[PDB]
Structure 1
Amino acid sequence: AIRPTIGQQMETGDQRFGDLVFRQLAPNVWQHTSYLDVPGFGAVASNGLIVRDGGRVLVVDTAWTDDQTAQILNWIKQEINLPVALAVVTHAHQDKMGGMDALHAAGIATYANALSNQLAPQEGMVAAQHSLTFAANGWVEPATAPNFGPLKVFYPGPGHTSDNITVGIDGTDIAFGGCLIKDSKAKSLGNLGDADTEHYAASARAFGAAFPKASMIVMSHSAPDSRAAITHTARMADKLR
């Protein structure tokens, strides 16, 4: 088993595949988990999603690296055997966009916040091939997110980064907060180096209001949690201002 220094541990319901871990969350949704080995510190887990939508699959976030992201595509090929139509990546940091080149080599259409694509070169990332844009209330402009099936993309405002986006899975009670949301038992909001400490609390709450009936909150570095992940994150963020 993989025992990361940071990130959730393995429990019943987890499938080890190569260097990665997969967990079924719903009949059509799986969480992918990949691990960055930090020398002298140990492994840091990062989570994303895989969603089946009829005869195709949709991905949220890459793994940390190209090779790990290729392993995600191999797991999808083995376990689902349907083509990946597109991937949405949730901001320009390594845990979310480190594996773009693997997606592109596979011919998968990639989407990110226009701002994430603009920041990518400055963050040592490769931009997605398509840019999402957002309304004044945070909802994605639908013309920029064609054929997204159940993925409902919401920009909650600046928080963990200025470009962080979130994704609800329509037809389920699952919503994905990425690195913006930490779990209900977290001590810290994680890396605040690129964070907006003034607006973080409002952005966390806006995510909760965007998906008000999501009962399972998925996030980058903990196991899926209740809505208390959202409220606890917001309460921690209240202390930043």
Structure 2
Amino acid sequence: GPGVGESLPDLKIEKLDEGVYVHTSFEEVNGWGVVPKHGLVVLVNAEAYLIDTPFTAKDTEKLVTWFVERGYKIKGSISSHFHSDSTGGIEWLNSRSIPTYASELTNELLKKDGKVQATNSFSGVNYWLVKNKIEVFYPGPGHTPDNVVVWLPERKILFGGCFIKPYGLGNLGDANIEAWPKSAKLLKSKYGKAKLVVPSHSEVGDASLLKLTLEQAVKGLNESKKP
């Protein structure tokens, strides 16, 4: 990229569907290496919504600038859970008067962590961030207590966030393996029609990713009985 030194990989902005872009950012995360984090930028008639933020303030300005530079007013940001791979750019967007959204639970968990909260918050299993266009859904505790997914109804796309772990559940300290199968069950129950499922840390797949995550969630409940 355009810098002066070694290389943590640059932010990626790739067009998924007609009004849906994927964004990938990368962070050193001890016990793992470079971790990729996928989010979405959803478009409505000249307005952009960040589904999750990049890891850092730095890539968040990057992502916002790209779309502002192509004619889009950044109309808001939804964080899918309180971990910094979804929330790490909330402070930047707050200082720029861009509405940041998170679930009431995400904001209290942000609070207990001493992190900056999203400015708006929603309470309840549902929340239309933009009615008939972006839907927030709470399948239940899993990756974290507060993790949510974001559904686009005219594209049948499902940002699963870190709740979707097709090939292994990953970091487990803040997780609820006992509740995760039930949420993964109820998630596929509602969004079986997912044409595309964008997870946080694995590449975009399809409806089976709901099936793959379900069966990985129940596999961790199995491994619970180790002694």
Counterpart of 2:82 (choices 69, 72, 92) is 92
Q: Is the 8 A contact 1:154 1:210 kept in 2?
A: no
Tell me the alpha carbon deviations over residues 43-99 of structure 1, each in whole angstroms, 9 at most, x when there is no partner.
111011001111211110111111111111111123x32101111100110101011
Is 2:22 the counterpart of 1:31? yes
1:51 aligned partner: 42
Whole-angstrom CA distance in 1 between matches of 2:207 and 2:53? 24
Change (3 A) 1:39 1:236: closer
* Deviation at residue 215 of structure 1 after TM alignment: 1.5
* Deviation at residue 19 of structure 1 after TM alignment: 2.1
Gaps of 5+ in 1: 2-17
Is 2:225 the counterpart of 1:238? no
2:148 aligned partner: 165
2:48 partner letter: V
Counterpart of 1:180 (choices 140, 146, 163) is 163
1:115 aligned partner: 105
Q: Is the 8 A contact 1:150 1:169 kept in 2?
A: yes
Whole-angstrom CA distance in 1 between matches of 2:103 and 2:136? 10
2:73 aligned partner: 83
Whole-angstrom CA distance in 2 between matches of 1:155 and 1:116? 11
% same residue: 35
1:88-237 aligned at under 5 Å gives the runs 88-134=78-124, 138-140=125-127, 145=129, 147-148=130-131, 150-183=133-166, 186=167, 188-237=168-217
* Deviation at residue 124 of structure 1 after TM alignment: 4.2
Whole-angstrom CA distance in 2 between matches of 1:218 and 1:121? 27
2:43 partner letter: R
Tell me which stretches of 4 or more aligned residues in structure 1 moved more than 6 Å.
none
Gaps of 5+ in 2: 2-8, 222-227
1:162 partner letter: P
Change (3 A) 1:194 1:235: same
Task: Name the Cα RMSD after superposition.
Answer: 1.8
* Deviation at residue 126 of structure 1 after TM alignment: 1.2
- TM-score normalised to structure 1 length: 0.83
Counterpart of 2:52 (choices 61, 64, 70) is 61
Whole-angstrom CA distance in 2 between matches of 1:149 and 1:41? 38
Aligned length: 214
* Deviation at residue 123 of structure 1 after TM alignment: 2.7
2:88 partner letter: G
Whole-angstrom CA distance in 1 between matches of 2:58 and 2:184? 32
